[PDB]
Amino acid sequence: SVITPGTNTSNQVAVLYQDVNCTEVNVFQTRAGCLIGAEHVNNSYECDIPIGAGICASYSIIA
Amino acid sequence: VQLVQSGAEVKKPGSSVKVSCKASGGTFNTYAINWVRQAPGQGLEWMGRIIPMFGIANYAQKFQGTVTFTADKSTSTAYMELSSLRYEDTAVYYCARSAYYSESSGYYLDYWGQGTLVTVSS
Amino acid sequence: ASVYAWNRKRISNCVADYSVLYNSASFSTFKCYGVSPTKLNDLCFTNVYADSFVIRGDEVRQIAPGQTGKIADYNYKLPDDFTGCVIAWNSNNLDSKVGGNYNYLYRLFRKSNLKPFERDISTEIYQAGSTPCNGVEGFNCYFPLQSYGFQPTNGVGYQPYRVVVLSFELLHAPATVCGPKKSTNLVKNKCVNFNFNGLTGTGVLTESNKKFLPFQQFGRDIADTTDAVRILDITPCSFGGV
Amino acid sequence: QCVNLTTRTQLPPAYTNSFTRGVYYPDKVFRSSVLHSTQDLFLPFFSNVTWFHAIHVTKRFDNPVLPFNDGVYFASTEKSNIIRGWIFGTTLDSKTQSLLIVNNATNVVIKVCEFQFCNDPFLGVYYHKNNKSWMESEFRVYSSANNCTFEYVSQPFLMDLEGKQGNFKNLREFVFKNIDGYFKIYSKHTPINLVRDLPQGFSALEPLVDLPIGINITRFQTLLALHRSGDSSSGWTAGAAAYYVGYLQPRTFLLKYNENGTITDAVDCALDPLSETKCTLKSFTVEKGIYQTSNFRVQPTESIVRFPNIANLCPFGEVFNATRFASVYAWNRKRISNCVADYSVLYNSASFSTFKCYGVSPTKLNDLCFTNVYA
Amino acid sequence: FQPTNGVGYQPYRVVVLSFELLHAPATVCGPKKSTNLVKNKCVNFNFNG
Amino acid sequence: EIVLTQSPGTLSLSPGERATLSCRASQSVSGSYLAWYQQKPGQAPSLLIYGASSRATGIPDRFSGSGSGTDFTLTISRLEPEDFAVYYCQQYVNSPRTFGQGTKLE
Ligand SMILES: *[C@@H]1O[C@H](CO)[C@@H](O[C@@H]2O[C@H](CO)[C@@H](O)[C@H](O)[C@H]2NC(C)=O)[C@H](O)[C@H]1NC(C)=O
Ligand SMILES: *[C@@H]1O[C@H](CO)[C@@H](O[C@@H]2O[C@H](CO)[C@@H](O)[C@H](O)[C@H]2NC(C)=O)[C@H](O)[C@H]1NC(C)=O
Ligand SMILES: *[C@@H]1O[C@H](CO)[C@@H](O)[C@H](O)[C@H]1NC(C)=O
Ligand SMILES: *[C@@H]1O[C@H](CO)[C@@H](O)[C@H](O)[C@H]1NC(C)=O
Ligand SMILES: *[C@@H]1O[C@H](CO)[C@@H](O)[C@H](O)[C@H]1NC(C)=O
Ligand SMILES: *[C@@H]1O[C@H](CO)[C@@H](O)[C@H](O)[C@H]1NC(C)=O
Ligand SMILES: *[C@@H]1O[C@H](CO)[C@@H](O)[C@H](O)[C@H]1NC(C)=O
Ligand SMILES: *[C@@H]1O[C@H](CO)[C@@H](O)[C@H](O)[C@H]1NC(C)=O
């Protein structure tokens, strides 16, 4: 899955491998898979790009 | 069927020579031509073979770089060139036939020419 | 030319008379694949590729696409689609000589099968054993090339067939070769059956304001259907429901 | 007659980054205002291409051997027409049929023939100090040409031949492809106003010609025109120019046309995930969101076969190494049943004069299932 | 057969082996070239057919 | 390189009896790729046999090969005065068609 904030906004891209333990191929592992290219933060905001399993992403790209 | 050979060559040491084996009609295309040294008072040594259709000549390790094999598709004549006359190169070279094929795997010398005597003189 | 050295000629920028071939009927095999025979072959091709060889009568079948044999895998193969024709005729008088003619050669053995089209002229000694043989005829290593040997008094399976294999690329964009049957007839603004490169269809010709390029003949809009053809626009005549 | 070129200072090859350059028309079909996705041999976006210089200042005379894998993109920055053409082939020693392109003033002469190419094929323009005039002087490319039929003609006009002062002003883009017995040359010309760089922007590459040759090409050269005004083997002036060489690979590109017939923009699908999702959506603008584009999968490293081991062994040793063998009239038969067999047991000793096998042969077929074995 | 004699006049033991090629019973088979195990990586496996 | 050694170098001694001319090789001759040759003095060799035992055109079947493995036999069943000539061997297995040293040389 390609997570983007829109070409009109920025060209930054986050890549989500769904249900893949991607230790063998900014890596963040969740039960929905593993996300690369977005910095995980400890805050909680309104969901913008629904990744899944209670995890969302928003615009650098944060998860 | 008849493969007449060139006459004896009067070659002073170091002077090159080219033999002239003459193929009868139908000999070159169907069959390969091979050269044997037949050194004086000694045995027979296989210099190499000429494929007169695809122009392929392969030589043994001993004679490599010392002899050149050429054949003329038109006039059906076989030629062997000696780079220079080294002292041991005196001999009676012979040209013979071959099969150079798969179905017939006997690669024997079908018909042999009369022979050419090379030496320091006559 | 021999089967191993399959000669190719390019038929370019000329009108063709496919119907003289059909009405000759002297050719032993005149099988056509993809293209239809019986006067329907006179349709435009980008390139007409002709390859001619003299093969044995029994080996004619192998030339067909997706067929396997010695000739097919070591001398000449055909692509599976094979938009084109296979043409053969018996050259027993012309290509058989008394005492046999050994001027025609087939590749009995080779290391691997070939590409769909491939001309191997190599004379490297085929290897059948551990020993290299130094590219000389020894045990378990023979000349890959093997003779035919057509004889005047011989079986039909063992007599020479002159074979011309014609391939037809149906891209049709260059339009080099085209049947002289059609004419211009100066037709526009009416429901007609357009035909400009051997691609038939129905519709109304219309003047074209779009600008093409010298290398461009056709123009296709969305749905990959013919819209403009060398410049005239193709607009199908009115249709609808009642 | 060719002369070996000396007084050249060695310098490691240079490389530069090409930005969205090397896109041509995939076919001869007119399209307009449509996003077309096609797979063909293209130069990758933001790739590396090799840079070759020629600076008067050594003299940097660059003309080495370059491979021809699946097609070559050749960009040329010029102001005095230093590059005159190219040659293509496999050995360039007249053993195999070769090709050569040369922009001669009288006629372009694409020659497809067996040429005995020398070590340093080149051209040379003489300069006269008596009056301002430049004329072609030397042409040392080939020596023999016997076995061939193809030869061409065209109508170029007298060009400049003079070495102007300043920066590069002409960009010549070429793509040479060899497929289906065709040598396709696609060309474009552009006016550029830089000094020593790679021009930006995007430009379509129209088909110039499609030679129907069908030859095997593996190595190719580049032909330069030098300038002269002591020794002829060692003395020459290079003339200021540069040229870029790149290699195409099979990729899928999404192209966006205009109301006209030209190609205005293109994107490489396999460049980065952003371009991947642009190709997936069949659009050049991607709205904010999450999109499933591809599917990652681990490719198997190797193939493994584990079978039951040899546990029952056939008594071939009993039959072969027996103390007493039967007479010919009383031929003795033994049945080898229900045991795996060491078919690697009848030639490795090769004591046997004959391991002449009929029908089965000494092969893996030997070392295979047998209904009954009679010895 | 005599000890000092030509090999043409010397004994050759011959062990004629008859093998039919239908192979439906398959009573005798080769070792079948078993390889080794390489687990913990994606692999194309073929255990016993 | 497969060397050949002819064993009876001068057994003939103006022979009036059947002969057993021999050739032996370092590696066994594979698939009977051997030949024999008739080199009458002052003249070129003439093929006598090919394969192992296959006879030749215009050469009587009294000339008989009897070899396998290390191919080694040329047998004159009834000896004739005119046939006297140094006899040579040649192997087409691996070797650059090398010859032996001759068995019936004076
Ligand atoms: C030019 O492209 C080449 C690709 O062949 C790059 O060459 C090597 O790239 C690796 C990693 O990508 C580096 O570790 C090497 O140091 C590179 N250089 C060599 C082998 O000379 C190269 O990076 C690209 N760019 C330039 C400026 O050469
Ligand atoms: C073009 O010629 C080259 C010779 O340099 C061919 O490359 C060889 O191909 C043979 C197979 O025919 C291989 O056994 C060699 O190992 C190859 N050598 C090298 C250096 O690559 C090439 O295959 C030819 N291409 C075509 C299409 O005929
Ligand atoms: C986004 O779009 C608006 C109008 O559609 C435009 O003004 C703006 O420049 C665009 N953003 C960028 C970064 O180009
Ligand atoms: C699989 O994912 C888990 C996350 O809970 C991780 O601890 C484990 O190391 C991963 N497996 C491998 C082989 O890396
Ligand atoms: C993790 O979360 C806690 C509580 O929200 C916060 O205090 C801390 O700074 C966070 N750390 C990072 C590295 O985000
Ligand atoms: C003047 O130039 C011409 C070529 O343009 C040249 O042929 C001629 O030799 C020149 N004159 C002198 C005196 O060199
Ligand atoms: C090539 O031309 C030469 C003439 O120099 C002549 O040998 C013959 O016509 C041709 N040979 C081959 C092998 O094509
Ligand atoms: C390209 O299209 C524009 C319209 O936007 C037109 O003005 C221009 O003339 C066209 N180009 C050519 C070469 O006709």
Kindly tell me the sign of the dihedral angle through the C-alpha atoms of D1, D6, D12, D15. Answer: negative
Residue in chain F lying closest to D352 (CA): F69
Contact A44 CB / ligand 5 (< 6 Å): no
Helices (H), chain C: 18-22, 70-74, 92-95
HEC sequence for F11-60: CCCCCCCCCCECEEECCCCHHHCEEEEEECCCCCEEEEEECCCECCCCCC
What is the third-level CATH fold of B9-119? Immunoglobulin-like (2.60.40)
The first and second tokens of residue D97, run together, are 């049929």
- C211 near D CB under 8 A: yes
Task: Please give the Cα distance from C218 to C224 (Å, whole number).
Answer: 11
Instruction: Specify the DSSP element, H or E, that contains C165.
Output: strand C160-168
* DSSP assignment of D197-218: S---S-----EEEEE-------
Give the integer Cα–Cα distance in Å for D124 and D136.
6
Tell me the C-alpha distance between D220 and D29, whole Å: 31
Say if CB B85 and CB B118 are below 8 A apart: yes
CA D148, CA D110: separation in Å to the nearest integer? 12
Q: Which residues pair with B36 in a beta bridge?
A: B46, B94
Query: Which residues, 6+ apart, have CB-to-CB distance to C30 below 8 Å?
Result: C21, C22, C37, C85, C86, C87, C88
C-alpha to C-alpha distance for B82 and B66, rounded to whole angstroms: 6
* D372: contact with E, CB 8 A cutoff: yes
Q: Which two structure tokens, joined as six digits, stand for A17?
A: 């491998």
Which strand (E) or helix (H) includes residue D102?
strand D98-102
**Cα separation, C152 vs C167, whole angstroms:** 31
Contacts of B111 (CB under 8 A, 6+ apart): B1, B2, B3, B96, B97
Q: C70-86 b/e with 16+ CB inside 10 Å = b?
A: bbbbbbbbbeeebbbbb
User: How far is the centre of ligand 2, averaged over its atoms, from the C-alpha of C116 (Å)?
Assistant: 16
Q: Sign (positive/negative) of CA torsion D286, D291, D293, D297?
A: positive
Where are the domains positioned within chain F? 4-91
Q: Which two tokens stand for residue C71?
A: 């000739």
Q: How was this structure determined?
A: cryo-EM
Could you tell me which chain D residue has the CA closest to the CA of C173? D28
Q: State how far the Cα of B109 lies from the Cα of F34, in Å rounded to an integer.
A: 11
C136–F contact, CB cutoff 8 A: yes
Helix (H) or strand (E) holding C54: strand C48-56
Question: CA C39, CA D254: separation in Å to the nearest integer?
Answer: 41
**A15 in contact with chain D, both atoms CB, cutoff 8 A:** yes
Residues 6+ apart with CB under 8 A from B9: B17, B19, B116, B117, B118, B119
Q: Which ligand is nearest to the CA of D15?
A: 1
Radius of gyration, alpha carbons of chain F = 13
Query: Which E positions 15-34 lie with beta carbon below 8 A of chain F?
Result: none
- What letter does residue C66 receive in the DSSP assignment? T
Q: How far is CA C2 from CA C75, C148, D124, D161, in A?
A: 9, 10, 45, 49
DSSP codes, D209-251 = EEE-------EEEEEEEEEE---TTT--B--SEEEEEEE-EEE
State whether residue B88 is helix, strand or coil.
helix
Residues closing a segment before a gap in chain D (C–N exceeding 2.5 Å): 57, 229
The token pair that represents F64 in the structure block: 């008989």
Chain B interface test: which of F43, F91, F99 (most B C-beta within 10 Å): F99
Task: Show the tokens assigned to D273.
Answer: 């995930």
**What kind of fold does domain F4-91 have according to CATH?**
Immunoglobulin-like (2.60.40)
Contact C154, F49 (CB under 8 A): no
**Residue D14 in 3-state DSSP?**
strand
* Contact status, residue B46 vs residue B98, Cβ threshold 8 Å: no
Residue B10: both structure tokens together? 């009067």
Fill in the DSSP letter of residue D80: S
Pairing of strands E44-47, F4-6: unpaired
| Interface probe with E: pick from F53, F66, F70, F71, most Cβ of E within 10 Å | F66
E6 chain-F contacts, CB cut-off 8 A? 20, 66, 73
Candidate from D130, D132, D134, D229 with most ligand 6 atoms within 8 A of CB, to mutate: D130
Q: State the burial class of residue D281 (Cβ atoms within 10 Å of its Cβ: 0-12, 13-18, 19+).
A: middle
Amino acid at D208: L
Residue D319 parent element (H or E): helix D316-320
F92:C138 CB<8 A: yes
- Does D146 contact ligand 7 (Cβ within 6 A)? yes
Q: Do E6 and F69 touch (CB under 8 A)?
A: no
Degrees (nearest 5) of the Cα angle C55, C60, C66? Answer: 120
Phi–psi pair at D97, nearest 5 degrees: -60, 135
**Per-residue DSSP letters for C178-236?**
--TT---TT--SSEE---SSS----EEEEE--S---TT--EEE-TTS-EEEE--EEEEP
CA angle centred on D252, ends D251 and D257, rounded to 5°: 130
In one-letter notation, the amino acid at residue B18 is K
CA of B68 to the centre of ligand 2 (A): 28
Q: In whole angstroms, what separates CA C137 from the centre of its chain? A: 36
Yes or no: say if C204 and C192 are a contact pair by the CB < 8 Å rule. yes
In sequence order, the β-bridge partners of residue D100 are D87, D111
Q: Nearest by CB to D360, from E21, E24, E29: name it.
A: E21
Coil, helix or strand at residue E8: helix
Q: Which residues, at least 6 apart from D336, have a Cβ–Cβ distance to it below 8 Å? A: D314, D315, D316, D319, D372, D373, D374, D375, E28
CA dihedral for C34, C40, C41, C47, sign (positive or negative): negative
Contact predicate C11/C179, CB 8 Å: no
d(CA C125, CA C146): 12
